[PDB]
């Protein structure tokens, strides 16, 4: 009925994106005015300089550029106080075109929340420091413009099967290396990240250009200049994502572009996923499995194991889910990925490769660090005292293999970390400790090698420049931990071999004390060194272990002992005053922001008032047609995958049920400011031609919403809730509607449920939503008691 032509009805949709931009540019104008306000305030502040900014003078300048002033009429689109702007959106909302009305609903959210939308945008900003900042700004501008010109001129300098192409092949490399260099600087021994240059670069948006360049198809068979260009782009991206967390989130949006079996393309992948708890909490299964499949398909590479080692342990925090998931797929990976030398025949191959690796002469290292990485990743993914990972990893590498490799004379120090610490994380640092470790003399066979290693490390006073830093780290950390965990563990005290090998314990304690005598100890490692000494002293005191008087006296002694200036100042103070002023302005808008948030529901409650009378629009709005149609729109908002809009609409509509009418001194003035702004704004929008609203009682507001179909909306949303947030909001809305024990809504729910044979989904959803809670609570509440 009344089939409006689609080609003419798409017109309004085409005006919608015009409205988007003409509303967006107002934000730039408002933030420019806000910057000018602070320009004036700092101009009057620094000239006098006791430095505090005039907030009581800033507030009216900020509120005079937002609304209710003579010079605020050009910001309003229709130059009529916004009275006629809302009616077009309201009229378009009743139209029968889904994306048109979907955009129309989005427009009014921006129109009412102008105060909110301005403040975050102004709080996200940045500014220039000294002439160096200006130079960097200019250089990055020209570099990006020149690069973009060539990007749109790609088909001229690309071989699809000095000249301009030859000139570009060179000139692009210098600009790419300049953009890469601007990201991170390198000191003598510390790699620091520049947090301001990266912010300027991301504000410019070089990442989009680099990603678009990477997307371009290419042939690596013949032209290696292109291959090194792509590698340089990857290097710049890695430097851009390094040292920051939000850049990694920004680049995460193009993970589907980086599912390639390439090497450096995979090198970018761990840089994207390094040191990010939140980002790794939602890792994709497919990428992780595809990396292992690439190992099984495209040879053995360390770039694929670095990603796994990074994702299993992010931010230094153990990840149980990733730890279990790694060996959930490692078992099915076959022996192609998991290669281990267990028997004597394979151990001989390991030793013959070890000798050549000790020579370090070619064709031995690539297989060498790969096995090192495999063992280290097993150790890292077996932390957390989790039974599953350790039991599954025990099969791949037992204690006997680790003992055999560590006891061999060609074991270089780097190998000792790789297997000794893995032995710790696989047997000692376990919730279910294996009693075979503490009941066997193999542990003392390992102590002997540790004693010889510590004697070697402490005897390195002949060549300081040739000292092994890795060996020092091993001595300071790994042995200390594997001894402290062993002695401090109450379960290991049941071993009867403690008093059978006193002479080796004497020399072991002597060596542990000797480690403290080293002058190369790091402050962090010194605590680890001292912890083992303290644990050994406590164990000796408790077990009455015979110790020589001299060593005991040494331990007791250790225990008992334990122009340019003004120019810098101006901008340095400016930057830190910007944060203060932003915070002050953000604080002095909350009493106002809920005013318009309530104007939302105020206008929605009475949408017919705004339009002039004796009109079809007012006739249809007076009957509740606006809310009724918005209900069926919100019914299908989730279908088109619009979750944020559906949440923001359900939460706003739930405000129809909370009837509120208006340190206590601050709250009083804030509430009065909010009421003062709300009344003037609502009266300006209304323009009805000493008045009282006389709102209808809350008892029949719920019935009025019931008659518009809000009873059906909640049930249908609950059945088809694909997300926890949508279902939670539906539950809150249903609670709000049925407040006070209304019988109309109850009868509507009953009749809908009994008249529809598809309530099975409804009740199954409710049944499962608590069955999952029961399953979780059964495993959650387990503490017993421990006495006072």
């Amino acid at each position: 009925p009344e089939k409006e032509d689609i080609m003419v009805m798409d017109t309004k949709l085409k005006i919608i994106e015009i409205l988007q931009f003409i509303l967006n540019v107002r934000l730039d104008y408002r933030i420019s005015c806000l910057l000018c306000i602070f320009k004036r305030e700092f101009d009057e502040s620094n000239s006098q300089s006791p430095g505090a900014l005039d907030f009581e003078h800033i507030e009216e300048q900020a509120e005079g550029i937002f609304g209710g002033s003579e010079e605020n009429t050009p910001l309003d689109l229709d130059d009529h106080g916004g009275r006629t702007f809302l009616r077009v959106l309201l009229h378009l909302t009743m139209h029968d075109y889904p994306p048109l009305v979907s955009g129309a609903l989005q427009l009014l959210f921006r129109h009412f929340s102008q105060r909110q939308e301005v403040l975050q945008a102004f709080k996200q900003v940045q500014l220039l420091v000294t002439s160096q900042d200006v130079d960097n700004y200019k250089q990055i501008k020209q570099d990006l413009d020149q690069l973009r010109s060539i990007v749109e001129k790609s088909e001229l300098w690309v071989y699809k099967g000095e000249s301009t192409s030859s000139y570009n092949y060179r000139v692009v490399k210098e600009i790419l290396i300049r953009l890469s260099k601007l990201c991170v600087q390198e000191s003598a021994s510390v790699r620091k990240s520049r947090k301001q240059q990266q912010r300027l670069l991301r504000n410019m948006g070089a990442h989009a250009v680099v990603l678009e360049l990477l997307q371009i198809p290419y042939e690596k068979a013949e032209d290696t200049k292109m291959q090194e260009i792509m590698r340089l782009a990857h290097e710049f991206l890695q430097n851009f994502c390094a040292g920051n967390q939000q850049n990694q989130a920004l680049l995460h949006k193009h993970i589907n572009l980086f599912l390639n079996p390439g090497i450096l393309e995979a090198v970018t992948m761990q840089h994207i996923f390094m040191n990010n708890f939140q980002l790794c909490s939602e890792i994709n299964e497919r990428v992780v499995q595809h990396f292992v499949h690439c190992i099984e398909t495209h040879g053995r590479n360390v770039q694929y194991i670095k990603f796994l080692q990074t994702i299993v342990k992010a931010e230094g925090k153990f990840i149980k889910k990733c730890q279990d998931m790694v060996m959930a797929e490692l078992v099915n990976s076959g022996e192609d990925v998991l290669v281990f030398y267990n028997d004597r025949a394979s151990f001989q191959t390991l030793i013959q490769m070890m000798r050549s690796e000790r020579d370090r002469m070619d064709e031995n290292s690539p297989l060498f660090m790969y096995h090192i990485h495999l063992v280290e990743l097993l150790a890292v993914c077996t932390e957390g005292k989790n039974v599953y990972t350790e039991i599954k990893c025990n099969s791949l590498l037992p204690l006997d293999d680790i003992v055999r490799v560590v006891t061999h004379e060609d074991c270089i120090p780097e190998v000792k970390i790789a297997y000794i610490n893995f032995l710790n994380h696989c047997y000692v640092d376990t919730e279910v400790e294996m009693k075979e470790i503490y009941t066997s003399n193999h542990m003392w066979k390992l102590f002997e090698n540790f004693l010889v290693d510590i004697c070697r490390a402490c005897n390195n006073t002949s060549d300081r420049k040739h000292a092994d830093s890795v060996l020092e780290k091993y001595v300071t950390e790994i042995v200390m931990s594997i001894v402290t965990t062993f002695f401090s563990s109450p379960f290991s005290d049941q071993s009867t071999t403690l008093q059978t090998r006193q002479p080796v314990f004497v020399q072991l304690l002597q060596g542990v004390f000797r480690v403290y005598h080293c002058n190369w100890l790091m402050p962090s490692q010194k605590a680890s060194v001292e912890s083992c000494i303290r644990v050994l002293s406590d164990v000796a005191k408790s077990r009455a272990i015979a110790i020589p008087v001299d060593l005991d006296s040494q331990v007791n002694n250790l225990f008992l002992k334990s122009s340019v200036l003004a120019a810098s100042r101006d901008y340095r103070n400016i930057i830190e005053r910007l944060q203060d002023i932003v915070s002050a302005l953000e604080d002095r808008l909350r009493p106002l922001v809920q005013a318009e948030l309530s104007v939302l529901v105020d206008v929605l409650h009475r949408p017919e008032l705004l339009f002039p009378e004796n009109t079809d629009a007012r006739r249809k709005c007076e009957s509740g047609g606006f809310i009724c149609k918005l209900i069926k729109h919100t019914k299908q908002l989730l279908e088109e995958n619009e979750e944020k809009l559906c949440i923001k609409v359900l939460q706003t509509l739930r405000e129809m049920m909370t009837k509120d009418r208006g340190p206590p001194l601050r709250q009083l003035e804030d509430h009065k400011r909010g009421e003062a702004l709300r009344q003037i704004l609502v009266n300006r929008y209304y323009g009805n031609i000493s008045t009282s609203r006389g709102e209808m009682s809350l008892a029949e507001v719920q019935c009025h919403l019931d008659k518009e179909g809000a009873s059906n909306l909640v049930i249908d949303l609950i059945m088809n809730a694909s997300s926890d947030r949508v279902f939670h909001e539906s539950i809150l809305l249903a609670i709000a509607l049925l407040e006070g024990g209304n019988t109309t809504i109850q009868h509507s729910f009953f009749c809908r449920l009994t008249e529809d044979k598809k309530s099975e989904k409804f009740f199954k959803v409710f049944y499962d939503r608590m069955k999952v809670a029961q399953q979780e609570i059964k495993a959650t509440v387990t503490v017993n008691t421990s006495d006072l």
């Binding site: 078992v331 039974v387 039991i391 025990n394 099969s395 037992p398 279910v432 017993n784 006495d787």
Partner: protein, 237 residues
Amino acid sequence: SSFLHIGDICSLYAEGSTNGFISTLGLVDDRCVVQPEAGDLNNPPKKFRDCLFKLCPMNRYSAQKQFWKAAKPGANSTTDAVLLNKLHHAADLEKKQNETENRKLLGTVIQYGNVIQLLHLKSNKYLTVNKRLPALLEKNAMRVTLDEAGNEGSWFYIQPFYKLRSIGDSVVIGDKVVLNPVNAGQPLHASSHQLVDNPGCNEVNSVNCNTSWKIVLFMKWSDNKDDILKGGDVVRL
């Protein structure tokens, strides 16, 4: 049509890489072993009181597990005696009620997707899978043993090996099924490895596989009356 019931007595016959009746290695030992060459479904082994299992319903174990944890030497106190007495009384009541529903649930039909416990008649020990220990002969596999009282590892999902029957259907005697512990989540697997101390014996462990446990009926629950004479009984002439 004949259907399974609670209290039925039947054997298990694995089919696949190794085919044979599952069994034990005496009362002193507590290791489940399948013996391939000892017999077949047409030619049963000479000794046939080791392969018999009695179906039992799911039993609560929360109070029993709590009492086991309390009995662990980790908290010693003078007032702990009363708490241990209360826990022992709760466990006793829990065992008594488990026996009551065990009496009351006999004869009910068994359907796919249910939870069942296997009681070895000879050793009077339930079949259990421990989730913290690996198999003695197989490292990547999972440990399977026996226990007199049982724990949460004794619960077994019953699932169809064939697509003919789905969850909710009653189990018909003679169909190959798959056993899955509730907690271990891995089917019982008949390994092809050989025990060192016993020739021919094959270890039974818990790992993903394609082994089907063809249940073979031996005696119905109704026939299981103590006051009558029934096959397999031992008497004196």
